[PDB]
Design an enzyme around this catalytic site. Structure first.
Site, PDB file in Angstrom:
ATOM      1  N   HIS B  77       0.786  -1.190   0.000  1.00 45.95           N
ATOM      2  CA  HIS B  77       0.000   0.000   0.000  1.00 45.95           C
ATOM      3  C   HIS B  77       0.856   1.295   0.000  1.00 45.95           C
ATOM      4  CE1 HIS B  77      -4.178  -1.906   0.884  1.00 45.95           C
ATOM      5  NE2 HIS B  77      -3.446  -2.697   0.118  1.00 45.95           N
ATOM      6  N   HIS B 244       0.034 -12.579  -2.763  1.00 47.15           N
ATOM      7  CA  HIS B 244      -1.058 -13.429  -2.252  1.00 47.15           C
ATOM      8  C   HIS B 244      -0.573 -14.876  -2.039  1.00 47.15           C
ATOM      9  CE1 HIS B 244      -4.332 -10.208  -3.404  1.00 47.15           C
ATOM     10  NE2 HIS B 244      -3.447  -9.721  -2.527  1.00 47.15           N
TER      11      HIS B 244
HETATM   12  C1  HEM Z   1      -5.111  -6.404  -7.958  1.00 44.68           C
HETATM   13  C2  HEM Z   1      -4.280  -6.083  -7.019  1.00 44.68           C
HETATM   14  C3  HEM Z   1      -4.670  -6.419  -5.596  1.00 44.68           C
HETATM   15  C4  HEM Z   1      -5.828  -6.491  -4.928  1.00 44.68           C
HETATM   16  C5  HEM Z   1      -7.226  -6.104  -5.456  1.00 44.68           C
HETATM   17  C6  HEM Z   1      -5.497  -6.817  -3.566  1.00 44.68           C
HETATM   18  C7  HEM Z   1      -6.434  -7.003  -2.566  1.00 44.68           C
HETATM   19  C8  HEM Z   1      -6.182  -7.358  -1.246  1.00 44.68           C
HETATM   20  C9  HEM Z   1      -7.170  -7.450  -0.251  1.00 44.68           C
HETATM   21  C10 HEM Z   1      -8.620  -7.045  -0.370  1.00 44.68           C
HETATM   22  C11 HEM Z   1      -6.572  -7.813   0.842  1.00 44.68           C
HETATM   23  C12 HEM Z   1      -7.253  -8.085   2.137  1.00 44.68           C
HETATM   24  C13 HEM Z   1      -7.201  -6.868   3.097  1.00 44.68           C
HETATM   25  C14 HEM Z   1      -7.633  -7.403   4.439  1.00 44.68           C
HETATM   26  O1  HEM Z   1      -8.829  -7.743   4.559  1.00 44.68           O
HETATM   27  O2  HEM Z   1      -6.862  -7.615   5.431  1.00 44.68           O
HETATM   28  C15 HEM Z   1      -5.223  -8.075   0.476  1.00 44.68           C
HETATM   29  C16 HEM Z   1      -4.275  -8.668   1.302  1.00 44.68           C
HETATM   30  C17 HEM Z   1      -2.934  -8.749   0.958  1.00 44.68           C
HETATM   31  N1  HEM Z   1      -2.362  -8.439  -0.249  1.00 44.68           N
HETATM   32 FE1  HEM Z   1      -3.295  -7.845  -1.814  1.00 44.68          FE
HETATM   33  N2  HEM Z   1      -4.276  -7.133  -3.465  1.00 44.68           N
HETATM   34  C18 HEM Z   1      -3.647  -6.731  -4.560  1.00 44.68           C
HETATM   35  C19 HEM Z   1      -2.301  -6.802  -4.890  1.00 44.68           C
HETATM   36  C20 HEM Z   1      -1.269  -7.101  -3.979  1.00 44.68           C
HETATM   37  C21 HEM Z   1       0.164  -6.981  -4.254  1.00 44.68           C
HETATM   38  C22 HEM Z   1       0.825  -6.433  -5.484  1.00 44.68           C
HETATM   39  C23 HEM Z   1       0.803  -7.364  -3.125  1.00 44.68           C
HETATM   40  C24 HEM Z   1       2.208  -7.504  -2.790  1.00 44.68           C
HETATM   41  C25 HEM Z   1       3.218  -7.730  -3.520  1.00 44.68           C
HETATM   42  C26 HEM Z   1      -0.264  -7.810  -2.186  1.00 44.68           C
HETATM   43  C27 HEM Z   1      -0.041  -8.401  -0.979  1.00 44.68           C
HETATM   44  C28 HEM Z   1      -1.061  -8.632  -0.064  1.00 44.68           C
HETATM   45  C29 HEM Z   1      -0.834  -9.371   1.198  1.00 44.68           C
HETATM   46  C30 HEM Z   1       0.460  -9.885   1.753  1.00 44.68           C
HETATM   47  C31 HEM Z   1      -2.000  -9.409   1.858  1.00 44.68           C
HETATM   48  C32 HEM Z   1      -2.317 -10.061   3.220  1.00 44.68           C
HETATM   49  C33 HEM Z   1      -2.407  -9.179   4.410  1.00 44.68           C
HETATM   50  C34 HEM Z   1      -2.411  -9.836   5.736  1.00 44.68           C
HETATM   51  O3  HEM Z   1      -2.007 -11.012   5.790  1.00 44.68           O
HETATM   52  O4  HEM Z   1      -2.827  -9.192   6.740  1.00 44.68           O
HETATM   53  N3  HEM Z   1      -1.511  -7.690  -2.792  1.00 44.68           N
HETATM   54  N4  HEM Z   1      -5.022  -7.901  -0.868  1.00 44.68           N
END
Ligand code: HEM
Ligand code: HEM
Ligand code: NA
Ligand code: NA
EC number: 1.11.1.21
Lengths: 713, 713
Positions: B77, B244
């Protein structure tokens, strides 16, 4: 384009502490306006202004061939925004040329007046500020028309962005009272800190209160608003009758002919506004206020015809060509000249607010006296005009050039000339050690000095530790200053001073004003030593002691700090949250947010709180100068909740055990809540910051000590 | 409190040029972050971050015992607000800690993540910025969980107030498209310069476009937004599947349980927000997005399970416990571990946006390839992560510390190392004289140098004269740069250079990049001499010449100045008024209002306008460096009106005769209309200001010439 103000409208706005940076200033960082002014050929400026008065420009032709009246109104509006409550407004920053003032309805066509002055501003350049020029032009208008002024001081440095001022909460220009953002409550009580009856007015509505043409009622508003601009009855009558000896109003046709104010006009209008579709839009067809009144038979010459007309006729209610209520002399001949046509004449006319001067019983006596004794009227008007135009300039030491009056006036909060040698560095060190050996504590020393110095406000340059007015009425009785404690501290300091002064040769002595400050500096040095730091707090001598007789008790009243977040003090319960009042105080003290933050954190741990309140005192080493406030405030092992008894006090408890560690107010906890302040707190709360904290604290302390030291500029 | 923004909502806002002053900055004037960072024990910081990963706090317990996933999200973010159009957003100023980004809905509970970092920030103090810390923590989270990063650079200095960014015009958080302030028009066309689908999102809606769970359509938004953040298909797939591979989403109960975002919360929340009433409000009961997805069988370890799951199951549409659309694996066993309860397991789940990676035809091929070749996936993700987190940092010379990768990447717009002696002052004088003897005019010299240097933007530190990219595609073909004329000037400069270089000993040579700038300086000197002044323009050598292969033609496209008020240029008709675009450009150039004002006045009279347009060329001595622009603009003998054929061109005519004197655009006339700008124009248009004008112009010229010179910082 959506902003943080739009998302979070009640979040505290710190940008008011970060205006007037070197970024927005086109002059070098070294530019000293006082020095540019002192080389201005002022006489040559006045000769040019004199010629301008009768040199009509076709784009805004001069009424009666003379701009005098227009420029007097210009200079009275520049001065007339002033409020004694906070010192904001007035002529002293030239703010009439920026938003919002440049576009207020009551400033209509003063854009023309300012534009007329561009050639002279351009000729003299930086050697005369706009701020000084506006006032000087009004003086020269008066002179050219046969009125001898009391004097003139230069020194008002120009500013380069709009001042941040609370003008009211109304969302509609000129809104009548009683609306959803009414500036009135109770029995026609105007909210502090406002000094005008409707948004975009200077003082009152010239038709009468909320447009109701009752001179008796209008007089009440006049007295209230003028009192809120630091003017009494004699001064008020003198100003209004004095001003309305000259020139005329403009209402030649319906107001719906007038277009957009300057800030709303098209780019092609080049900073002008109120463009009018009525006939030629100017001169004989001018529309400004909507009223069409010419007060005297010689609108371009000083006379005593205002009061001759006021008292010599009975008055009838009528309407201008734009529909405004105004008054005409019953059965009078056509004796008043036309502004453009030599073959036409008109009956005497008056505003409702002019009739106030006859139909209010207290004004009527003053008016009669001035009618019967036009030399007293002249003298009172001269004095009031000088006061009006200089009330926000500050101590006489700021006054520049060759027309400064030598008479010292009470409203200047005057300070005697120093007539002896000053203490030197070795004397300062001896005095500090004597202060500390007396048994006065860090807390007492810091509190007393803070109390003395923190009356300063940069808005009108009043207050500060110079004068030692903290020992005098009313400062010595203010609740925030803890009168019984203050008296005991002052008595101890006076014994030290008497002992020091009695031992000296060659006439060297120290003022109580200087010693109060120096004692505070000793407190801060000792606090630093108690934390293991060796620092010297700078100190500049030269303050003098003012007398009670040189101290107006009523004008001092507005300096009372009814909110002082730096001492965690609020005198009562206000509509405005305490954190907003903190930022307001910081702005008046000329502090940035980092300054405010350092200063508050330090004051807390030095014991500066009123009543020895433990709120925000987040340290186990009170009276040592440490960054404990920040380290403790930012400690996530503490959880904070509002108390059951008081939503504005918070308890900080250990998150694990529930044990009570601290209490704090809104002013304390805002530094852990507001995202910009918390970022600042973090800096001073870091493990590498104790030395930085001490050095920044000492710098800001010294800054505050010196705010009123224009003798050293 | 009613403000100028409330009265005049469309008036130009200059405060964006005066942010980040020394007033709001708590560090000294001399604080150099690079030097503080270079003494940080980086190894010690990483060890502490490693320890933090599994040190669960009760107020926000760690999913699976490990905060890695949360911190990866936090870092992605921080980087993910970036827009290639203007370079604004990104990780490089630490803005996630300030409004509005601290309170965007898609940043929910990242306030917890940042608070977890406070003890480490506090321990290392100023030697590590928040901005660096957020990124470093992401890196460390990856490493802790078995993923080897490509590298890390420090140097992102902290900022102390909110950056001024246009995030959109919507007045509702997360507003769906087609509203009164729709960021979409036509065939799903996102307005420049935006790079997110809804107000308060990072890139796209995880449920699908406007909440519609179509993965193929979602893919179009993913491709569009990521392209708008400088990422291609390979990079995008690697980032999304890479990210993810870790952690989980949080949607354990209805969203109506979640309270105020940080900027709206009560003061007792101490900077945190989204407090939840659902069960414990945290941990197993956490609600962040409203989705409840855990992607892999080992959420705390790097694996290849994202793509095994994506391709190994068929997916069915379902809802989270909060009602949000998401996907569940048809017929699967419960193989995914629970975040808190060892006795529970869950079926594989995915977001709509994860399924994009399979159901979009172009992504599917990339995804398959990464599935079949996990080494390629790992390497691409490492590279993309480095790019994501460093794309807004600028040239490699700004990169600090011991983990900077040695590999040079194309998106760093690399410039070759200087490997020869530089020209000295005598060589500079000789080159200037040759430039002036060649017949190149002041106008050509100034225009070419301006064109070269003014591609810089401080938002991401891209662009500037270093590299001589003006001679390469696409800069040499931009309409604003006048390709025909540019090629003639470059060919003459290249002959001068070839002749100078062929005469040298000992390897000394001058780059074209340096000579372009130097020749511009000669033009300014010549202009000054034409006005009767003796002026030497400072010049610092050391630029080198990049090759076409080191200059990515597509990423350069965003630097095209489709509005350049400094050359009175607008490429087409825009919904944003041209004076707003001028201020935007000035902000990107790091100019204050006074700097912008002086610079533009000077450029006008030196002939820098595109196409030799006479608009704003208010002088009869073109190619002489004078303040004529200001003196003529402010001349009240001229009346201005918009033209019949074009409301954005104005004619200025003699008020007395009606003769046409000048024409100008909105960009020209705004300096005579806006009250703050006009105040600045007045300073430079005064009779005492000719010398000041010349010297301030030369200073601002030099500033612009050096914007990208991080090799000298
Ligand atoms: C289309 C692009 C993406 C979408 C729509 C997206 C969406 C989200 C959403 C909705 C969450 C859940 C937020 C929550 O409820 O805690 C999340 C979690 C996360 N995303 Fe993404 N994401 C995107 C791209 C990315 C990218 C580029 C990265 C990193 C390189 C990333 C890494 C993460 C990680 C590590 C989590 C987990 C957070 C946790 O474990 O608390 N995401 N993502
Ligand atoms: C109750 C206080 C006051 C009220 C309500 C008031 C009201 C007004 C109004 C409505 C106008 C007409 C504007 C126009 O249509 O052009 C005006 C004109 C003027 N006022 Fe006042 N006034 C007050 C006090 C003062 C003071 C204190 C001064 C100066 C000492 C002043 C000096 C003038 C002058 C010189 C003009 C003439 C402008 C010209 O000739 O263009 N007035 N006044
Ligand atoms: Na003031
Ligand atoms: Na950026």
């Amino acid at each position: 384009g959506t902003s943080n103000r739009d998302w979070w409208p009640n979040q505290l706005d710190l940008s008011i502490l970060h205006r007037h940076s070197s970024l927005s200033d086109p002059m070098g960082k070294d530019f000293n306006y006082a020095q540019a002014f002192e080389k201005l050929d002022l006489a040559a400026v006045k000769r040019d202004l004199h010629a301008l008065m009768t040199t009509s420009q076709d784009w805004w032709p001069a009424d009666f061939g003379h701009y005098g009246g227009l420029f007097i109104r210009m200079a009275w509006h520049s001065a007339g925004t002033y409020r004694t409550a906070d010192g904001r407004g007035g002529a002293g920053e030239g703010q009439q040329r920026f938003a919002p003032l440049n576009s207020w309805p009551e400033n209509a066509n003063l854009d023309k007046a300012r534009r007329l002055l561009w050639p002279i501003k351009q000729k003299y350049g930086r050697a005369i500020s706009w701020a000084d020029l506006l006032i000087l032009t009004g003086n020269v208008a008066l002179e050219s028309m046969g009125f001898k002024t009391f004097g003139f001081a230069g020194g008002r440095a120009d500013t380069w962005e709009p001042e941040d001022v609370y003008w009211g909460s109304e969302k509609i220009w000129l809104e009548l009272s009683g609306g959803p953002n009414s500036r009135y409550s109770g029995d026609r009580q105007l909210e502090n800190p406002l000094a005008a009856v409707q948004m975009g007015l200077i003082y009152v509505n010239p038709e009468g209160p909320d447009g109701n043409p009752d001179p008796v009622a209008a007089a009440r508003d006049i007295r209230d608003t003028f009192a809120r601009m630091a003017m009494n009855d004699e001064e008020t009558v003198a100003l209004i009758a004095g001003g309305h000896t000259f020139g005329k109003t403009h209402g030649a046709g319906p107001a719906s002919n007038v277009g957009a104010e300057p800030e709303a006009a098209g780019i092609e209008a080049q900073g002008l506004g109120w463009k009018s579709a009525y006939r030629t839009g100017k001169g004989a067809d001018a529309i400004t206020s909507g009223l069409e009144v010419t007060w005297t038979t010689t609108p371009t010459q000083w006379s005593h015809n205002f009061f001759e007309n006021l008292f010599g006729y009975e008055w009838e209610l009528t309407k201008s060509p734009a529909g405004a209520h105004q008054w005409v002399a019953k059965g009078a001949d056509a004796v008043i000249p036309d502004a453009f046509d030599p073959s036409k004449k008109h009956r005497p006319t008056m505003l409702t607010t002019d009739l106030s001067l006859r139909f209010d019983p207290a004004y009527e006596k003053i008016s009669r006296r001035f009618h019967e004794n036009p030399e007293q009227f002249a003298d009172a008007f001269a004095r009031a005009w000088f006061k009006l135009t200089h009330r926000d300039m500050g101590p006489r030491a700021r006054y520049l050039g060759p027309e400064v009056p030598a008479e010292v006036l009470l409203w200047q909060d005057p300070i005697p000339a120093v007539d002896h040698p000053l203490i030197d560095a070795a004397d300062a060190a001896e005095l500090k050690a004597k202060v500390l050996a007396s048994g006065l504590t860090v807390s007492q020393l810091v509190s007393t000095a803070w109390a003395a110095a923190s009356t300063f406000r940069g808005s009108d340059k009043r207050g500060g530790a110079n004068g030692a007015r903290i020992r005098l009425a009313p400062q010595k009785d203010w609740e925030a200053n803890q009168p019984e404690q203050l008296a005991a501290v002052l008595e101890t300091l006076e014994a030290i001073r008497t002992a020091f002064n009695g031992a000296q040769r060659g006439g060297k002595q120290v003022s109580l004003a200087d010693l109060i400050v120096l004692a505070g500096c000793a407190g801060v040095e000792q606090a630093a030593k108690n934390a293991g730091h060796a620092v010297t707090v700078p100190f500049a001598p030269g303050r003098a002691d003012a007398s009670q007789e040189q101290t107006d008790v009523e004008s001092m009243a507005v300096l009372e700090p009814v909110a002082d977040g730096f001492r965690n003090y609020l005198k009562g319960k206000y509509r405005v949250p305490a954190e907003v009042l903190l930022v307001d105080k910081a702005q008046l003290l000329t502090l940035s947010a980092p300054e405010m933050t350092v200063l508050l954190g330090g004051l807390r741990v030095l014991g500066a709180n009123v009543g020895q309140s433990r709120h925000g005192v987040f340290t186990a080493r009170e009276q040592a100068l440490t960054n404990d406030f920040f380290v403790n405030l930012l400690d996530m092992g503490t959880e904070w909740k509002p108390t059951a008894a008081d939503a504005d006090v918070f308890e900080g408890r250990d998150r694990a055990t529930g044990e009570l560690k601290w209490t704090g107010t809104r002013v304390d906890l805002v530094f852990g809540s507001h995202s910009q302040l918390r970022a600042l707190a973090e800096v001073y709360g870091s493990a590498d910051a104790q030395e930085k904290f001490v050095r920044d604290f000492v710098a800001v302390w010294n800054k505050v000590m010196n705010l009123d030291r224009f003798d050293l500029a």
